[PDB]
């Protein structure tokens, strides 16, 4: 979901 997408994008 978006939360996971935020996780990966900020890495």
């Amino acid at each position, epitope marked *: 979901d*978006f*939360k996971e*997408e*935020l*996780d990966q*994008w900020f890495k």
Partner: antibody
Amino acid sequence: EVQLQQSGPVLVKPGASVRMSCKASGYTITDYYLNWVKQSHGKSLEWLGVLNPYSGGSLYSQTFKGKATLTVDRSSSTAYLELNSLTSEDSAVYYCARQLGRGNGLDYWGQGTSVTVSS
Amino acid sequence: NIMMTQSPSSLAVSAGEKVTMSCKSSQSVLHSSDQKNYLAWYQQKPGQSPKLLIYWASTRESGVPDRFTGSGSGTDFTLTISSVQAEDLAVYFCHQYLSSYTFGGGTKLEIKR
């Protein structure tokens, strides 16, 4: 000190595009992420997306995909928000706001750019 | 999306009074990798840009007076101002950034004199 200087207010015709700027000073623009947040009235805030000033990449809210485009000019320490296909409902103050990392709040906000969409 | 609801819409107190205001999320804002509630509070004074007060639900931003305190877990969050000052009048917004960022509708704090 830290400052986010945003460009002046604009009047735009419905259907057109607008690009506004957010100039970082007092810190290295590439050390923080930069969000864009819309305020339609005093009691409303809505997130558009976030820019990675170092890489130039961006992550958009699904609401603003295909509507907003985030860019950056690292040499001039300036980030940009472009909005297309403007409607009268796109009228709002648009803030840029920096964010250190994933878990941080929006620790500093520009003064906002007032966009009025009207004939 | 995660919806944020704030209550009350507005309140008014005399200087020196204590104030609490509520912020509820439609689901948990707890980030698993660091076990922090991705919950922030902002103060927006009239004609000014928002100012960060609290992050991680309870961590006070540098330069924020100690009278501002955030608390809560799960889906029920609270901003407390222990002794309201005349300059504290603003709209206070809460903010979840676990998922696609959403903000509460704000609580407008007014001063009685």
